[PDB]
Structures are given as structure tokens and as C-alpha cells.
Amino acid sequence: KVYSRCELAAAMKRLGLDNYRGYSLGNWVCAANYESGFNTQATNRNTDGSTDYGILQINSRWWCDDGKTPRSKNACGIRCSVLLRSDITEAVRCAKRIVRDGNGMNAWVAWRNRCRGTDVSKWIRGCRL
């Protein structure tokens, strides 16, 4: 599923991400934009044999099981395929765990790159929620 910006904002709001560990909703929408273009089916392969999955490009070395990544630690306890589904419930649950790991949203390089230190409220402008 490719979400629209406001559809995703509303879904993430409903699933409890707004101000999760102090990160306002716009942070999460912005991160998703730059990680995956709002596409739950996005995948990106890396040189350690890992792959990033889904709308928040969650990595298979550390966070999910894709059956083909050496030294995987699958800390979210999920098959990476669940992160390709249209329903983002499981992706959000994993993202919450990631952001409890100790680095906050620094876990998402696209967030560091394009969202950190910007007015992230623009990402929820115009949305009904």
C-alpha cells in the first residue's frame, strides 16, 4: 500500500505515535516520507546481506527475520514480511521498540537527514486526523 501523507498521519495518530517518547507526529510522517515514500512494500538491500523493509525501512540484521540475513538478531520478534503489509500496526509496534532502544529517532537516517531540526508540523498540515 502506498499511503497518502494525511492518510498515514491519521493512521499513525490512531496507533499512538503522536508524542511517543516525546516525538510529535510530524516526525514520524516525515521519516516515512524520506525512508520509503509512504510505501509499505519498499525494500532496500545492503552489503551485509541485510535488507530494510516497509514504510519505516526496518533493518533485518537487528529488528526482523527475513530468513536470509547473517547474524540477524530479530529484536522485534517478527517476520520482515509482516512489515510489507498494508496495515501498519506491526510496523508501528516495532518502530516503538526501536525508538526505546536508546538512540531515539536517530535510528532512522532519513529522519536525521531531513526531519531533525525542521518544523515537522508541516507534515500534518491540512490533515483531519
Domain boundaries, the chain: 1-129
Q: How far apart are CA 120 and CA 92, in angstroms?
A: 19
Interior angle at CA 85, CA 22 and CA 16, nearest 5: 20
Interior angle at CA 49, CA 47 and CA 51, nearest 5: 95
Residues 6 or more apart whose Cβ sits within 8 Å of residue 48: 61, 69, 70
35 has catalytic annotation:
yes
Strand order in the sheet with 51-53: 43-45, 51-53, 58-59
CATH 1.10.530.10 assigned to 1-129: yes
Q: How far apart are CA 126 and CA 45, in angstroms?
A: 34
Phi then psi for 29, rounded to 5 degrees?
Answer: -65, -50
Q: What does this entry list as its resolution, in Å?
A: 1.6
Eight-state DSSP code of residue 32: H
Identify the active-site residue in 7, 35, 48, 65. 35
Q: How far apart are CA 9 and CA 60, in angstroms?
A: 25
Phi then psi for 38, rounded to 5 degrees?
Answer: 70, 25
52 has catalytic annotation:
yes
What the block records as the C-alpha cell of 64 is 526482523
Identify the active-site residue in 52, 87, 90, 119. 52
Determined by X-ray
